[PDB]
Structure 1
Amino acid sequence: MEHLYIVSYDIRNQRRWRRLFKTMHGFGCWLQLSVFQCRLDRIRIIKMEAAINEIVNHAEDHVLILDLGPAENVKPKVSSIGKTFDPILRQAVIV
């Protein structure tokens, strides 16, 4: 069972920002100007929180990780006003 995580950050050093944008494209897909949506099971959430405890500087950065739900029933939990919202789908890439 996988969950849908929403990750939003404030990073106060451009190098650390590059490092974190690096890592986050490693894990989820871009959603908003500083927000990523990640569809992860347990192993990968452990990996993500391991990565973002060494990418960031705990003194002045801020990363927020929200566990919306079981990633099958997230659509009632998210309401988007501008663009459409479409959760990450677990299917192969055929192209």
Structure 2
Amino acid sequence: MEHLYIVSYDIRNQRRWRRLFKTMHGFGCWLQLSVFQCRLDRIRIIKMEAAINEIVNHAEDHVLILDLGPAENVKPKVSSIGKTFDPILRQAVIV
């Protein structure tokens, strides 16, 4: 039980930005100039909107999660006119 969730955030204050950047980067990889992506299950998405949803103000900050498919059929339901679209791979980081 795991999907791919794209976070489309647009805040307003660097004192909240830097924190949101680093935090939600801790969840998934950089995708687009304001939007990241993650591959998560129920518990970790819950802990996402736990770690997120207080780093930001709820008036001057807009963030938006996007629950896509189960992250293995994500390729059909998204296309990238510019560079490629690459779901993050659950792979042992052998580096």
TM-score range normalised by the length of the shorter chain:
over 0.9
- TM-score normalised to structure 1 length: 0.97
Calculate percent identity across the aligned residue pairs.
Answer: 100
- Matched residue of 1:76: which SS? coil
Structure 1 residue runs without a partner (length 5+): none
Structure in which a larger fraction of residues adopt strand: 1
- How many residue pairs were aligned? 95
Runs (4+) of structure 1 exceeding 2 A deviation are none
1:40-80 CA-partner distances (Å, limit 9, x unpaired): 01111000001111100001100000001111100000110
- TM-score normalised to structure 2 length: 0.97
The offset of 1:13, in angstroms, is 0.5
The offset of 1:14, in angstroms, is 0.8
Structure in which a larger fraction of residues adopt helix: 1
- Matched residue of 1:94: which SS? coil
* Alignment match, 1:43: 43
Structure 2 residue runs without a partner (length 5+): none
